[PDB]
Ligand binder design. Structure first.
Ligand code: U7J
Ligand code: ZN
Length: 257
């Protein structure tokens, strides 16, 4: 099955998922001089005050912090979006070294990691329906660079030892995702896809310009996770990122001058 190794990694995915070579694949390089300011874009509205986190899961590709999305509790609206998008989960992609790990790049720069806050358009009723629609999902992407610690990340870091291997989960209630945001909500936006199989072209990407800083100790703990299940030879969960894909006939728009 698909993964991030030499024999099952991103260059192989197209054999099982031919949309990997499609017309609106993600991630992409954000060329900051070619992205055009769109004065028509609204400010993002990130309304996470009522978020209800439930569980954290190692799924063998990353770890997901899952939320109660049975009601409009934590939602993303505004910006390029029409309607209301409910937060279902967040996860990260990261590298084996600080110089790689992000999926999007900025003028070819790779960050140490990238946070994806995944939301689905409530007009489609459930996430599985939403992923079949060109406007079904909105993923808020936030870059991580290594420097000072991010206090709001530490509760995530400290539970990772309890979910070291594929298929392990742990209770993860009362986590506030507002503690993972940078100060500014300036962003780039473009139409794209899921960055893992099935690579469905259902995502409005909203990538924040301002990275958050995390400490070396925090990211080192990400890199102690395992792709493998318990009782299997250890394969460190590192470099779980897809590289930039062709932009093709797309425009990246900036919310800011
Ligand atoms: N990096 S990213 O771009 O942000 C990014 C990349 C990938 C994803 C996830 C895609 N994903 C796999 C999937 C999704 C759809 C598929 C459709 C057909 C065939 C295979 C598929 C595989 C799921 O969410 C699986 N969920 C089950 C795992 C769980 O519940 O833990 C379905 C949840 C669900 C909810 C309601 C109805 C049905 C399903 C998100 C973000
Ligand atoms: Zn992701």
């Amino acid at each position: 099955h698909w993964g991030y190794g030499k024999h099952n990694g991103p260059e192989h995915w197209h054999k099982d998922f031919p949309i990997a070579k499609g017309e609106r694949q993600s991630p992409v390089d954000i060329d900051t001089h070619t992205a055009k300011y769109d004065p028509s874009l609204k400010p993002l509205s990130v309304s996470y005050d009522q978020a209800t986190s439930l569980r954290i899961l190692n799924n063998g590709h990353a770890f997901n912090v899952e939320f109660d999305d049975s009601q409009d509790k934590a939602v993303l609206k505004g910006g390029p979006l029409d309607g209301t998008y409910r937060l279902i989960q967040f996860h990260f992609h990261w590298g084996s070294l600080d110089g790689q790990g992000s999926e999007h790049t900025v003028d070819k720069k790779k960050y140490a990691a990238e946070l994806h806050l995944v939301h689905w358009n409530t007009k489609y009723g459930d996430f599985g329906k939403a992923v079949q629609q060109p406007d079904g999902l909105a993923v808020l992407g936030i870059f991580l660079k290594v420097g000072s610690a991010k206090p709001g990340l530490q509760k995530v870091v400290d539970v990772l030892d309890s979910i070291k291997t594929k298929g392990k989960s742990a209770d993860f209630t009362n986590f506030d995702p507002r503690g993972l945001l940078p100060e500014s909500l300036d962003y780039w936006t473009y139409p794209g896809s899921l960055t893992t199989p099935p690579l469905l072209e259902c995502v409005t990407w909203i990538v924040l310009k301002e990275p958050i800083s995390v400490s070396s100790e925090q990211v080192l703990k990400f890199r102690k996770l395992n792709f493998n299940g318990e009782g299997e030879p250890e394969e460190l969960m590192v470099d779980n990122w897809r590289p930039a894909q062709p932009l093709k006939n797309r425009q990246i728009k900036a919310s800011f001058k």
